[PDB]
């Protein structure tokens, strides 16, 4: 199952100044970029057009080009409409796309955040506020819901265009999506808030896809103190992760770091301290 996410970030500093920047993700791989500075959407993969014809893509891009200009003016007008309730600066974020399921099933979404809080979604045939949203948004919602033309376009984008487009992306991008890249590991140590303790670190870098297993071990004994950090990105669309273990000084000998990953084909990495 793959989640396709179009992420829009719009900054409005005052009545005049604004910028909108967008990035598009299929799972954890970037497929598009659209800088405020660019008239056109940029492909970040050879296969980013999916299975759309040039005419289909040009038409879709045109719709987005009109959207970006229109969106900018609409926010500026909505600010005037709610004045002086809401003032600049304002950040608006959109997360739109679809989650793809086996055998023609999918679910689409369009979520909107205002000053970093999820307040609005498109659902069914209209815009609605979500639980916890402030009441003043009822007027913007009323105004947005008066626009039958936007409602029809969004319904089509979410219900039809998104799943169809992504199905083609998954076919076109298969070899990248299914790539296997091997982890490389290395060990190191530091002192950590310690009377006489140390912190061993097992570094694992360059693996794809994300799922990985990293454990400190003495023989066959999985050391339960193993703390694995967050998954951190490398610039080459691989992943980095480190697993730490807080141990007593002069008790490092015997410890090893074991790494299991789909790319290794059963041949685990074992690094002895």
């Amino acid at each position: 199952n793959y989640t396709f996410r179009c992420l829009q970030m719009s900054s409005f500093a005052n009545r005049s100044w604004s910028r909108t920047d967008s990035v598009v993700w299929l799972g954890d791989l970037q497929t598009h970029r659209w800088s405020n500075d660019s008239a056109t959407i940029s492909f970040t993969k050879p296969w980013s057009q999916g299975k759309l014809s040039n005419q289909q893509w040009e038409k879709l891009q045109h719709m987005f080009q009109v959207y970006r200009v229109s969106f900018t003016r609409d926010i500026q007008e909505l600010v005037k409409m709610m004045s002086p309730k809401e003032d600049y600066p304002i950040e608006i974020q959109l997360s739109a796309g679809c989650e793809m399921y086996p055998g023609n099933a999918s679910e689409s979404f369009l979520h909107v955040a205002f000053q970093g809080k999820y307040v609005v979604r498109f659902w069914g045939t209209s815009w609605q506020t979500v639980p916890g949203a402030p009441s003043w948004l009822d007027l913007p919602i009323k105004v947005l819901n008066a626009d039958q033309g936007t409602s029809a376009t969004v319904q089509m984008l979410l219900n039809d265009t998104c799943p169809l487009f992504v199905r083609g992306l998954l076919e076109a991008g298969k070899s990248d999506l299914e790539k296997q890249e091997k982890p490389v590991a290395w060990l190191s140590s530091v002192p950590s808030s310690a009377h006489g303790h140390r912190q061993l670190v097992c570094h694992v870098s360059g693996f794809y896809p994300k799922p990985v297993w990293v454990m400190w071990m003495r023989g066959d004994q999985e050391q339960q103190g193993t703390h694995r950090g967050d998954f951190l990105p490398n610039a080459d669309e691989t992943w980095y992760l480190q697993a730490t273990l807080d141990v007593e000084a002069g008790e490092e000998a015997g410890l090893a770091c074991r790494v299991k990953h789909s790319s290794l084909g059963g041949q685990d990495i074992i690094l002895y301290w």
Partner: T-cell receptor
């Protein structure tokens, strides 16, 4: 949805103060002032999204707008000039795109 | 010069003749297009509003077309009467809500000889 304007006709002198008034009982949030001049389409001067709101349109210079209530939207020419000789139209609307226009006001500013 | 252009600027027809009025625009986006009739020194009377990509409307002797791809509309008046003597104004609304701006043509003056 009806809209009224007063006065319907006005002769003024350069440097004098002129107030054009528009009234609507539709409970419309939104009101709009335009002028119509020969060789041009109607051009937006000022508009308002509710009591206390006034916003500049395309050609706001030399005009002040006033929205004291939901019902009333005024266009104020503090220092009238001959260039403001025109036909002025007010409109109102709700959240929908339709603007409901008043019957117009003819203003002549003499030297 | 402007985003909405009307043609002809003016025309003279005899009673009972048909005529066709043109509106061409560059406005983007184009949510809807309305035709107004304005009698001399009077107000704006809506004749029709066109909303679809390829639209046709009618209202008595008035009929209109809109082609949003060509950004072109025509107003047809069948069997003109003296009372059709007026200015006819094309206006494009750029939104399907109050967030829209109206873009007005400068009008076509029709005189009908009785």
């Amino acid at each position: 949805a009806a809209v009224t304007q007063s006065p319907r006709n006005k002769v003024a002198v350069t440097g004098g103060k002129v107030t054009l008034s528009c009234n609507q009982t539709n409970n419309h949030n939104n009101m709009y002032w335009y002028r119509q001049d020969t060789g041009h389409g109607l051009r937006l001067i000022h508009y308002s999204y509710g009591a206390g709101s006034t916003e500049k349109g395309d050609i706001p210079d030399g005009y002040k707008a006033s929205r004291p209530s939901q019902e009333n939207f005024s266009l104020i020419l503090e220092l009238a000039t001959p260039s403001q000789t025109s036909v002025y139209f007010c409109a109102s609307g709700d959240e929908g795109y339709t603007q409901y226009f008043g019957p117009g006001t003819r203003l002549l500013v003499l030297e | 010069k402007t985003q909405v252009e009307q043609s002809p600027q003016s025309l003279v027809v005899r009673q009972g003749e048909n005529c066709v009025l043109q509106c061409n625009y560059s406005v983007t986006p184009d949510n809807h297009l309305r035709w107004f009739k304005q009698d001399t020194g009077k107000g704006l009377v809506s004749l029709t509003v066109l909303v679809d990509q390829k639209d046709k409307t009618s209202n008595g002797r008035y009929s209109a077309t809109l082609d949003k791809d060509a950004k072109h509309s025509t107003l047809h008046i069948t069997a003109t009467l003296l009372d059709d003597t007026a200015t006819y104004i094309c206006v494009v609304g750029d939104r399907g809500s109050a967030l829209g701006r109206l873009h007005f043509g400068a009008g076509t003056q029709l005189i009908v000889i009785p």
